[PDB]
RNA sequence: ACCAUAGUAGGCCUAAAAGCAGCCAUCAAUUGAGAAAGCGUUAAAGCUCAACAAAUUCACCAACAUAAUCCCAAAAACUAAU
């Protein structure tokens, strides 16, 4: 959460995390969602919309980030580590923004 | 014992068999018994 | 307004007033015992960390 | 801009310390704040000092949320003693019963602090009894018939203790 | 290595066990939600907006919650209790107001739960509320 | 830098790293905490 | 989630009046007029007195021999007084005031002529003797933390030990000297006059058992 | 084995995890009762910097070491293999376990001096100009001291400083 | 890594002592937080610790420059050594 807070997240529009909680590979995406839904992240910028899509037969956790550079970061995280997803997201958004 | 499977609406096609057996029980009764059931349900519920 | 004693429920009179409850007095199966044990552990940590050089 | 906690008397509102610098640094006009403070606290004639929260916005505008007055002053009013005990535990500051504590709990159950929590009045009465413990006020379970005798003896004891304390303070001032 | 030096049960863990047993015995609606690290003021506001409907929220550590759940009849809830967790306890359930107060926050997702021994997902909860 | 025989952290942001065969207490917030093991 | 552990509560500890260390004089009220020889046997060998705790629970244990004079005494007194809690801790001396006179000769004097002039007084301390003993209702971590500085500033090597730590070390030494693998030991060889080694050895080595060499004590030498 | 793949298709970044097949342990170890890998395969006090087939099993393709919580070794052997891997890398073994840099391989440098059983880093040791006399001699350390417990068929101790 | 809300500025002196010049008590809310173990302000405010919720490789102390004509055998980690 601190890494996202220190990075200046004012340049993002929409972050949605779509997942099925009843699967066996959801720990990482749940950790990522909790990291991006922290209060430091929320008070960094209020113009962003964070959505948590919950399904049952989707079975494919994924994250979509639409930000004002006209850019769409889609991440199909089914085996990725939570820290790896966090650092990749940070390094992409700071490079493009 | 165990719990249910907790399915979803994406492929919802399996109904519990108790509903079907209750429907069969209603279908296998004569009109007088159906009227008696109607009277009992109106009195109680 | 002086209300009579019958209006006040029991949870006013049952509670202790003078002596704080101590560690050996409480039931080890009661949450207050664990709350007081946590408080004593915090007191321990404060006493141990009195030599902070930072 | 932030939040400021201010304990202000109900009937007193002055553009001075300690209210002076804390609003002067924030830039909020003190005359306004005094005007709305008088307008919002003129309905209470009891004259009880109360804590309040001032929410200063970045545009130098401010909001007020009024709250329940101070537990120390409530207990002092309920017991009849002007100031609390110096050494709590070694000396007795006053005497009250469960009735005053219950009344204080009921009037404090509507404050901004205990309004968000939804515990029963038992937690509030426990908190008030702990505050009185720190204050030095002693509480008894059932002394309604003896409280008058308790008052008539504790007033004499407290005046004697105050005279002794005044003599000791005068001696310390002379020696220093 | 030498054989197992078995651990002894303590008052805190026994209290947690009996508390969770009371939770799963007494009340009817046991909702499972993802505990989002939210601010204290907003959390207390949500507590008030839940107590206006008389629904409570509680948190139990996973180290004590997983074994009890796999021993009990709610072992199907195991994937829901991997990360941060929140148990919503309601007697005489009324899911309509709960969904109404949950929709006010977009990033606080309802994972699942049980409505009188009926394990349901978020869509099942929505259907029950609409029913 | 300060050359010392015994190194200690003067703040929680100092970090100890082995470089060039010696130990180094490096600090970013307060650069005066830079210590080198002699 | 973590498991709670009970606190050892100290209810049988009574803090006496004047818990701070008492002031010590550089010179005793009665000065020694007769100059004495500087015996080094008061440093050589293990300590016989002040080897056990009296009423305290922590102490400064000396792993070597030396002399403690007024500078060291003032250092320890001031440090303990400033870094010790008077309400929960108390400290005590285990070494007497400096009583052994030391004679010094001025620069430019050739050798001989007699004894010098008494300059100052010291207290001889052997290895294994406690210097400052403390007690109270506190734990061992803080007292060790603020006693290690005093032990380091002491001339001889020293450590901030407790009853439990001292017992643990003594049992560890006993276990080591009992499970020693090599059949040849200093005690056995010295007592049996193997190889005629008493010609090189000293008569005090039969008691020192090879652990004490001069004023230095090595606890790892069995 | 997992792999992170990034796809760039018109201002869109797709990051995906891919799981590949991995080789497993051999079916018959000499000592199944040991929990720890080397000292259940009976290689304790047997490996060295010369033994590359054992050192290369758990290391990253870029020459990095692997975490013990993933490998499973007892701490002494984990440290020993870390030292042995450092020694082999400095000596010049493991040629394919180097990062691939198309830019730096053209500007050749001085030829790599041959070395083995090197303890410290080549860029951190200052030459000994005094070298000491007979009684006080500053030795050149050779090999890691953690490898002093290896089996010695000759029986002579390994000279770690010469 | 993970976050920090409540009576409350606990009571006395002091222009001010709001966890923190000082003295006495050290209670009590939320499952979860010491009248506060470290920074900071004139007084605040604010930044950290321990408390829950998330995991759980190991983690107590131990490292210390130097002289003068020119450094000083060279070398060597495994073929069996009481
Ligand atoms: Mg020393
Ligand atoms: Mg509590
Ligand atoms: Mg913390
Ligand atoms: Mg120099
Ligand atoms: Zn620093
Ligand atoms: Zn092993």
The Cβ of residue E24 has, within 10 Å, a number of other Cβ atoms equal to: 18
Q: Is C6 on the interface with G (CB under 8 A)?
A: no
Best CA proximity match to A53, nearest among A92, A4, A14, A3: A14
Nearest 10 degrees: CA dihedral of G112, G114, G120, G125?
A: 80
Which chain E residues are Cβ-neighbours of A54 within 8 angstroms? 109-111, 121-122
Q: Which site among E31, E119, E122, E126 would you substitute to test the B interface, given the most B Cβ atoms closer than 10 Å to its Cβ?
A: E119
What angle in degrees, to the nearest 10, is found between the helix axes of E122-130 and E95-103? 120
How many structural domains is chain G composed of? 1
Range of the domain at G116: 2-222
**Could you tell me the resolution of this structure in angstroms?**
3.4
Best CA proximity match to D115, nearest among E104, E57, E44: E44
For residues D101 and D109, what is the distance between their CA atoms, to the nearest angstrom? 12
Q: Which residue has the tokens 């413990």?
A: D133
Q: A34: which 2 tokens?
A: 């909790």
Find how far residue D167's CA is from the centre of its chain. 28
Distances (CA, A) of H33 to H25, H69, H150: 15, 20, 22
Specify which residue's alpha carbon is closest to the C1' of nucleotide I42.
Answer: D21
| Distance measured from the CA of protein residue G145 to the C1' of nucleotide I8, in angstroms | 35
Query: Contact B11/A22, CB-based, under 8 Å?
Result: no
- Kindly report the backbone phi and psi dihedral angles of residue G210, in degrees, each rounded to the nearest multiple of 5, phi listed first: 75, 0
Cα angle for residues A10, A15, A17 (degrees, 5° grid): 150
Distances (CA, A) of G66 to G40, G98, G124: 10, 12, 6
Count how many pairs of residues, chain A against chain B, have C-beta atoms within 8 Å. Answer: 8
Strands across the sheet containing D50-56 = D2-8, D50-56, D62-66
**CATH code linked to domain D68-142:** 1.10.10.250
Q: Which residue has the tokens 């090189």?
A: G200
For residues G100 and G42, what is the distance between their CA atoms, to the nearest angstrom? 10
For residues H114 and H121, what is the distance between their CA atoms, to the nearest angstrom? 14
- Kindly report the backbone phi and psi dihedral angles of residue E58, in degrees, each rounded to the nearest multiple of 5, phi listed first: -140, 160
Coil, strand, or helix at residue B39?
Answer: helix
Q: G155: which 2 tokens?
A: 């001339």
Query: Contact C15/D125, CB-based, under 8 Å?
Result: yes
Of E36, E84, E111, the CB nearest to A54: E111
Q: Would you tell me which residues 1-38 of chain F have a C-beta closer than 8 angstroms to some C-beta of chain H?
A: 20-21
Which chain F residues are Cβ-neighbours of H126 within 8 angstroms? 21
Domain architecture of chain A: domains with CATH: 1-97 (3.40.30.10)
List of residues 6+ apart from G218 with CB closer than 8 A: G211
For residues H119 and H122, what is the distance between their CA atoms, to the nearest angstrom? 9
Architecture of domain D1-67: 2-Layer Sandwich (3.30)
Strands A14-19, A49-54: pairing is parallel
The closest nt to D126, taking CA to C1', is I28
Is there a binding annotation on residue G72?
A: no
For residues D147 and D97, what is the distance between their CA atoms, to the nearest angstrom? 9
Best CA proximity match to G162, nearest among G126, G197, G136: G136
List of residues 6+ apart from E7 with CB closer than 8 A: none
Tell me H151's DSSP state: -
For residues D54 and D23, what is the distance between their CA atoms, to the nearest angstrom? 10
For residues D54 and G19, what is the distance between their CA atoms, to the nearest angstrom? 49
Q: Tell which strand I nucleotides have any atom below 7 Å from a protein Cβ.
A: 1-13, 15-16, 18, 23-39, 42-46, 48-55, 57-58, 62-65, 67, 71-74, 76-82
Find how far residue G60's CA is from the centre of its chain. 7
Q: D45: which 2 tokens?
A: 């004639």
Q: Do the beta carbons of residue E111 and residue E34 sit within 8 Å?
A: yes
Q: Which residue has the tokens 């090595």?
A: G218
Q: Which residue has the tokens 């293990």?
A: G46
Backbone angle region of D47, left / alpha / beta, with phi > 0 → left and psi within -120 to 50 → alpha: left
For residues D165 and F34, what is the distance between their CA atoms, to the nearest angstrom? 56
- Encode chain E in three state secondary structure: CCCCCCCCCCHHHHHHHHHHHHHHHHCCEEEEECCCCCCHHHHHHHHHHHHCCCCEEECCCHHHHHHHHHHCCCHHHHHHHCCCCEEEEECCCCHHHHHHHHHCCCCCCEEEEEECCCEEEHHHHHHHHHC
List of residues 6+ apart from E99 with CB closer than 8 A: E110, E125, E126, E129
Best CA proximity match to G84, nearest among G161, G156, G164, G144: G144
Q: Is B25 on the interface with E (CB under 8 A)?
A: no
- Per the structure, the residues numbered 110 to 129 in protein chain E that have their CB within 7 angstroms of any atom of strand I are none
What are the residues facing F25 on neighbouring strands?
F16, F35
Tell me B38's DSSP state: H
Supply the DSSP string of F2-31, one letter for each residue: EEESS---SSTT-EEEEETTEEEEE-SS-G
Q: B42: which 2 tokens?
A: 């109106």
For residues G74 and G76, what is the distance between their CA atoms, to the nearest angstrom? 6
Domain architecture of chain E: domains with CATH: 1-130 (3.30.70.1730)
Residue ranges of domains in chain H:
1-162
- Encode chain G in three state secondary structure: CCCCCCCCCCCCCCCCCCCCCCCCCCCCCCCCCCCCCCCCCCCCCECCCCCCCCCCCEEEEECCCEEEEHHHHHHHHHHHHHHCCCCCEEEEECCCCCCEEEEECCCCCCCCCCCCEEEEEEEEECECCEEEEEEECCCHHHHHHHHHHHHHHCCCCEEEEEHHHHHHHHHHHHHHHHCCCCCCCHHHHHHHCHHHHHHCCCCCHHHHCCCEECCEECCCCC
Same fold, D1-67 and D68-142: no
Best CA proximity match to D33, nearest among D58, D17, D18, D13: D13
Instruction: State whether the beta carbon of D108 lies below 7 angstroms from any atom of strand I.
Output: yes
Q: Is D142 on the interface with E (CB under 8 A)?
A: no
- Per the structure, the residues numbered 43 to 72 in protein chain A that have their CB within 7 angstroms of any atom of strand I are none
Q: A73: which 2 tokens?
A: 């970061």
Q: Do the beta carbons of residue G197 and residue G189 sit within 8 Å?
A: yes
Burial classification of residue C47, based on how many CB atoms lie within 10 Å of its CB (0-12 exposed, 13-18 middle, 19 or more buried): middle
- Encode chain A in three state secondary structure: CHHHHCCCHHHCCEEEEEECCCCCCCHHHHHHHHHHCCHHHHHHCCCCEEEEEECCCCCCCEEEEEECCCEEEEEECCCCCHHHHHHHHHHHHHHCC
For residues G98 and G101, what is the distance between their CA atoms, to the nearest angstrom? 8
Spacing, Cα G144 to ligand 3 middle (Å): 25
Strands A71-76, H12-19: pairing is parallel
In this structure, is the dihedral angle defined by the CA atoms of residues F3, F9, F12 and F15, taken in order, positive or negative? positive
Q: Is F4 on the interface with C (CB under 8 A)?
A: no
User: Which chain A residue has its CA at the smallest distance from E36's CA?
Assistant: A34
First-to-final CA distance of chain D = 46
Residue ranges of domains in chain D:
1-67, 68-142
- Asked if residue G74 has a cis previous peptide bond (ω within 30° of 0), the answer is no
Best CA proximity match to A31, nearest among E43, E110, E84: E84
Best CA proximity match to G149, nearest among G91, G94, G96, G78: G78
Q: Is B4 on the interface with E (CB under 8 A)?
A: yes
Q: Which ligand is nearest to the CA of C31?
A: 2
Query: Contact G139/C23, CB-based, under 8 Å?
Result: no
| Distance measured from the CA of protein residue D154 to the C1' of nucleotide I12, in angstroms | 20
Q: Do the beta carbons of residue G160 and residue G122 sit within 8 Å?
A: no
Q: A49: which 2 tokens?
A: 């919309």
What are the residues facing G68 on neighbouring strands?
G123
For residues D33 and D55, what is the distance between their CA atoms, to the nearest angstrom? 12
- As a whole number of angstroms, the longest Cα–Cα distance in chain D is 59
Rg (CA), chain G: 21
Cα angle for residues G193, G194, G198 (degrees, 5° grid): 45
Coil, strand, or helix at residue D66?
Answer: strand
Count how many pairs of residues, chain A against chain E, have C-beta atoms within 8 Å. Answer: 59
Instruction: Specify the DSSP element, H or E, that contains H36.
Output: none
Query: Contact A80/H11, CB-based, under 8 Å?
Result: no
- Kindly report the backbone phi and psi dihedral angles of residue D120, in degrees, each rounded to the nearest multiple of 5, phi listed first: -75, -175
For residues D11 and D42, what is the distance between their CA atoms, to the nearest angstrom? 7
Beta strands in chain D (DSSP E): 2-8, 50-56, 62-66, 94-97, 137-140
Which chain H residues are Cβ-neighbours of A76 within 8 angstroms? 14-17
Rg (CA), chain D: 20
List of residues 6+ apart from D10 with CB closer than 8 A: D41, D44, D46, D47, D48, D49, D50, D69
Which chain H residues are Cβ-neighbours of A94 within 8 angstroms? none
Q: Which residue has the tokens 């990033």?
A: E107
Coil, strand, or helix at residue D58?
Answer: coil
Tell me D23's DSSP state: H
User: Which chain E residue has its CA at the smallest distance from A82's CA?
Assistant: E83
The closest nt to E16, taking CA to C1', is I31
The closest nt to D73, taking CA to C1', is I11
Best CA proximity match to G91, nearest among G62, G63, G55, G117: G55
């Amino acid at each position: 959460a601190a890494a996202l807070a220190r990075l200046g997240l004012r340049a993002v529009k929409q972050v949605r995390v779509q997942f099925c909680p009843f699967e066996k590979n959801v720990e990482s995406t749940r950790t990522f969602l909790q990291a991006v839904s922290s209060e430091k992240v929320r008070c960094t910028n209020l113009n962003c919309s964070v959505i948590a899509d919950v399904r049952h037969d989707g079975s494919e956790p994924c994250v979509d980030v639409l930000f004002g550079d006209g850019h769409r970061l889609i991440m199909r995280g089914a085996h990725l580590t939570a820290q790896e997803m966090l650092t990749a997201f940070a390094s992409h958004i700071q490079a493009r923004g | 014992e165990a719990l249910a499977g907790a399915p979803l609406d994406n492929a919802p096609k399996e109904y519990p068999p108790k509903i079907q057996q209750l429907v069969q029980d209603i279908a296998s009764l004569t009109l007088l018994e159906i009227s008696d059931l109607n009277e009992l349900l109106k009195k109680t519920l | 307004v002086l209300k009579p004693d019958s209006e006040y429920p029991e949870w006013l009179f049952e509670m202790n007033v003078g002596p704080p409850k101590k560690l050996e007095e409480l039931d080890p199966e009661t949450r207050e015992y664990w709350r007081l044990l946590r408080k004593h552990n915090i007191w321990r940590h404060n006493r141990l960390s009195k030599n902070r050089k930072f | 801009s932030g939040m400021i906690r201010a304990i202000v008397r109900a009937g007193q509102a002055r553009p001075g310390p300690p209210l002076g610098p804390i609003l002067g640094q924030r830039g909020v006009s003190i005359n306004q704040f005094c005007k709305e403070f008088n307008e919002k606290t003129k309905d209470i004639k009891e004259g009880i000092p109360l804590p309040t929260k001032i929410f200063v916005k970045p545009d130098r505008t401010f909001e007020i949320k009024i709250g329940q007055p101070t537990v120390s002053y409530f207990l002092k009013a309920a017991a009849g003693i002007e100031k609390g005990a110096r050494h709590t535990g070694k000396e007795v500051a006053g005497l009250v019963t469960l009735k005053h504590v219950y009344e204080i709990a009921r009037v404090k159950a509507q404050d901004d602090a205990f309004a968000l929590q939804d515990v029963p009045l038992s937690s509030v009465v426990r908190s008030i009894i702990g505050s009185a413990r720190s204050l030095g006020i002693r509480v008894v379970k059932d002394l309604s018939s003896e409280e008058l005798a308790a008052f008539q003896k504790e007033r004499a004891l407290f005046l004697a203790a105050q005279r002794e304390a005044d003599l000791a303070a005068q001696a310390e001032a002379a020696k220093k | 290595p030498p054989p197992t030096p078995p651990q002894e049960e303590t008052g805190l863990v026994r209290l947690l066990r009996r508390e969770i047993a009371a939770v799963f015995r007494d009340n009817r609606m046991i909702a499972v939600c993802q505990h989002v690290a939210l601010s204290a003021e907003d959390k207390l506001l949500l507590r008030h907006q839940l107590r206006k409907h008389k629904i409570l929220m509680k948190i139990f550590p996973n180290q004590v919650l997983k074994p009890f759940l796999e021993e009990s009849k709610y072992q199907n809830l195991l994937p829901l209790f991997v990360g941060h967790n929140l148990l919503l306890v309601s007697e005489e359930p009324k899911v309509k107001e709960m969904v109404r107060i949950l929709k006010g926050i977009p990033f606080l997702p309802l994972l699942g739960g049980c409505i009188d021994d009926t394990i349901l997902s978020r869509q099942g909860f929505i259907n029950y509320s609409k029913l | 830098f300060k050359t010392k025989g015994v190194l200690k952290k003067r703040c929680r942001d100092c970090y100890l790293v082995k470089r060039r065969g010696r130990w180094f207490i490096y600090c970013k917030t307060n650069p005066k905490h830079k210590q080198r093991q002699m | 989630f973590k498991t709670l552990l009970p606190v050892p509560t100290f209810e049988d500890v009574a803090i006496p009046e004047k818990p701070k260390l008492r002031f010590v004089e550089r010179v005793p009220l009665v000065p020694k007029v007769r100059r004495e020889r500087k015996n080094l046997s008061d440093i050589r060998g293990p300590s016989t007195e002040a080897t056990e705790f009296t009423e305290g629970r922590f102490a400064i244990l000396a792993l070597g021999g030396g002399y403690l004079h007024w500078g060291h005494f003032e250092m320890m007194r001031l440090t303990i007084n400033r870094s010790m809690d008077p309400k929960n801790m108390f400290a005590l001396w285990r070494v007497p005031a400096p009583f052994k006179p030391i004679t010094r000769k001025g620069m430019g004097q050739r050798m001989g002529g007699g004894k010098g002039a008494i300059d100052h007084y010291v207290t001889p301390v052997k290895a294994g003797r406690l210097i400052v003993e403390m007690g109270g209702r506190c734990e061992f971590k803080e007292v060790q933390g603020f006693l290690d500085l005093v032990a380091h500033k002491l001339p001889f090597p020293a450590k901030a030990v407790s009853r439990e730590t001292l017992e643990k070390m003594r049992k560890d030494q006993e276990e080591r000297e009992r499970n020693n693998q090599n059949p040849w030991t200093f005690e056995r060889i010295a007592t049996a006059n193997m190889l005629g080694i008493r010609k090189v050895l000293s008569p005090y080595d039969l008691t020192h058992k090879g652990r004490y060499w001069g004023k230095f004590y090595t606890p790892e030498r069995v | 084995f997992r792999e992170v793949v990034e796809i760039l298709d018109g201002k869109t970044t797709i990051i995906e995890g891919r799981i590949t097949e991995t080789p497993q342990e051999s079916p018959n170890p000499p000592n199944p009762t040991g929990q720890c890998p080397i000292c259940r395969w009976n290689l304790k006090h047997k490996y060295n910097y010369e033994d590359v087939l054992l050192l290369s099993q758990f290391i990253r393709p870029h020459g990095g070491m692997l975490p013990r919580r993933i490998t499973g070794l007892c701490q002494e052997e984990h440290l020993k293999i870390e030292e042995c891997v450092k020694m082999a890398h400095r000596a010049g073994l493991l040629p394919n376990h180097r990062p691939k840099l198309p830019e730096g391989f053209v500007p050749k440098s001085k030829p790599r001096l041959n070395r083995y059983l090197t303890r410290w880093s080549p860029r951190s040791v200052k030459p000994i100009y005094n070298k000491g006399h007979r009684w006080n001699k500053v030795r050149m350390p050779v090999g890691s001291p953690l490898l002093k417990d290896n089996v010695s068929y000759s029986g002579r101790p390994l000279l770690l400083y010469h």
